[PDB]
Amino acid sequence: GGLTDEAALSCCSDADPSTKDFLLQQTMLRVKDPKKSLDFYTRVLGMTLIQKCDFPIMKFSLYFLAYEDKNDIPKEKDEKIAWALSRKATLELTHNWGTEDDETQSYHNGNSDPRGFGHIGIAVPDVYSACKRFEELGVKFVKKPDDGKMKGLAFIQDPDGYWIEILNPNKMATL
Amino acid sequence: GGLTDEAALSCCSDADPSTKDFLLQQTMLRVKDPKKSLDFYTRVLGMTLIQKCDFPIMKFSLYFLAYEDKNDIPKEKDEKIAWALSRKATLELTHNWGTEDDETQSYHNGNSDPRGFGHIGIAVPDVYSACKRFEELGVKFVKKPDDGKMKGLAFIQDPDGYWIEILNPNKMATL
Numbered sequence: 570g571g572l573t574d575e576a577a578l579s580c581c582s583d584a585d586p587s588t589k590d591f592l593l594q595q596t597m598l599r600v601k602d603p604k605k606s607l608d609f610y611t612r613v614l615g616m617t618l619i620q621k622c623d624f625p626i627m628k629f630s631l632y633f634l635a636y637e638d639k640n641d642i643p644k645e646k647d648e649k650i651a652w653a654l655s656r657k658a659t660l661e662l663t664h665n666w667g668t669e670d671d672e673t674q675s676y677h678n679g680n681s682d683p684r685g686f687g688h689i690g691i692a693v694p695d696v697y698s699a700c701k702r703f704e705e706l707g708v709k710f711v712k713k714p715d716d717g718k719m720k721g722l723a724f725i726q727d728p729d730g731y732w733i734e735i736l737n738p739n740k741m742a743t744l
Numbered sequence: 745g746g747l748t749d750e751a752a753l754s755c756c757s758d759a760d761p762s763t764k765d766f767l768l769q770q771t772m773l774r775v776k777d778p779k780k781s782l783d784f785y786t787r788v789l790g791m792t793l794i795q796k797c798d799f800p801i802m803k804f805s806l807y808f809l810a811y812e813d814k815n816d817i818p819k820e821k822d823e824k825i826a827w828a829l830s831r832k833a834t835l836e837l838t839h840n841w842g843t844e845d846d847e848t849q850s851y852h853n854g855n856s857d858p859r860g861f862g863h864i865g866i867a868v869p870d871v872y873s874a875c876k877r878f879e880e881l882g883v884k885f886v887k888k889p890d891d892g893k894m895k896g897l898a899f900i901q902d903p904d905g906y907w908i909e910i911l912n913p914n915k916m917a918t919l
C-alpha cells in the first residue's frame with residue numbers, strides 16, 4: 570500500500586538553518602549529438618543557451634539551457650558563469666566528445682529496464698496549443714494530450730529519447 | 745572534438761513567443777523507499793514536501809519536493825495542486841507500491857551502463873561547510889570537494905544512489 574498523508578509527514582523534517590539559501594540548480598542529461606539537442610531545446614521548447622563550458626583535456630562540453638531572457642546574460646566571462654550557475658531550474662546537457670560519430674552508441678532514457686530517472690516536465694499555459702505546435706514541428710510523442718485515461722497531459726521526447734512531460738498545473742485531473 | 749562557440753550558437757534559435765511562459769517544473773526520479781527518500785531530501789538537503797498525490801488503481805504515489813516555504817502552501821485542496829505544480833525546480837519522487845519490500849529490486853542511477861541521466865545539482869553558499877555537515881550526518885560521497893579532477897565541487901548520493909552535485913556558483917569561474 571501507499572503511505573498515508575500522516576505517515577509521509579512523519580518522515581519529513583524542518584529545514585536545518587545551514588541549508589538556508591540552498592536552491593535546486595540543475596538536472597544533467599547526457600546527449601549524443603549537441604547540434605540536434607541544442608536545436609530541440611531552443612527552437613522547439615523555447616529555452617535559451619546561457620552557458621557553454623569546454624574541457625579539452627577531459628574531452629567533454631557542458632551546455633546549460635534555461636528559461637531565461639537572453640538579454641540577462643552577462644557580457645564578461647567570469648560574471649557569466651556565476652550568473653548561469655546560480656539560475657534555478659537549468660538543464661545541463663553533457664557532450665562526451667566523439668559520441669555523435671559512434672553508430673553503436675546511444676544513451677538510455679530510464680523508462681525501460683533498468684529504470685530510474687523518468688522525465689523532466691515543462692509547465693505550459695495550454696497543453697493542447699503547445700502540442701498542436703509540437704505536431705506541426707514533427708516532434709515525437711510518447712503520449713498525446715488526450716491519449717489514454719489521463720486527459721490534458723502529454724509526453725514528448727527529445728533527440729536522445731528522453732521523456733518530457735507537458736502539463737498545465739491549472740488543469741490537472743482530480744485525485 | 746567539441747563544437748566551437750559559433751557552431752553551437754548556429755544551432756540555437758531565438759525563443760518562440762508561444763513558449764514565453766513555459767517553465768522547467770520538475771525532474772522525476774523513481775524511489776525504492778519513500779520514507780528514506782523523504783528523510784534525506786528534507787532533513788539532509790532542507791527541501792519541503794509541497795504536494796503528495798496517490799493513485800490507488802495504478803498503485804503509485806508522487807512526492808513533490810521543492811525549496812519553498814511551507815506557509816505558502818495554500819489551504820484549499822484544488823488551489824494547492826495548481827500552486828505546487830507551477831513552482832519552478834521541483835523534484836518528483838515516484839513510489840511504485842511494494843518496491844520497499846522486494847529484495848531483488850533497485851533503481852539505476854544512470855552513471856554506469858547503460859548511461860543517460862547524470863545528476864541533480866544544488867547550489868550552496870559554501871561547498872566545504874555543507875560537505876563537513878554531510879560527513880557528520882553519515883552521507884555517502886561520490887566525490888569529496890578536494891578529490892578528483894576538479895577541486896571545490898562535490899557529489900553526494902541519495903538513498904537510491906542518485907548523484908547530487910554540490911556547487912557554489914560564485915567560485916565556479918576560478919576552479
Ligand SMILES: CS(=O)(=O)Nc1cc(NS(C)(=O)=O)cc(-c2cc(-c3ccccc3)cc(=O)n2O)c1
Nearest residue numbers: 687690717719722734741742743744797804836838
Ligand atoms: C498520465 S499517466 O498516468 O498515464 N502517466 C503518468 C505517469 C507518471 N509516472 S509513472 C507511475 O512513473 O509512469 C506520472 C504521471 C504524473 C501525474 C501527475 C499528476 C498530479 C496530480 C494530478 C494528476 C496528475 C503529475 C506528474 O508530474 N506526473 O508525472 C503521469
Ligand SMILES: CS(=O)(=O)Nc1cc(NS(C)(=O)=O)cc(-c2cc(-c3ccccc3)cc(=O)n2O)c1
Nearest residue numbers: 622629661663862865892893894897909916917919
Ligand atoms: C569536477 S569533476 O570533473 O571531477 N566532475 C564533474 C563531472 C561532470 N560530469 S561528467 C563529464 O559526466 O563526468 C561535470 C562536472 C561539472 C563541472 C561544472 C563546471 C562549470 C563551470 C566551471 C567549472 C565547473 C559544472 C557542472 O555542473 N558539472 O557537473 C564535474
Ligand SMILES: [Zn+2]
Nearest residue numbers: 597661865909
Ligand atoms: Zn552538473
Ligand SMILES: [Zn+2]
Nearest residue numbers: 690734772836
Ligand atoms: Zn511528472
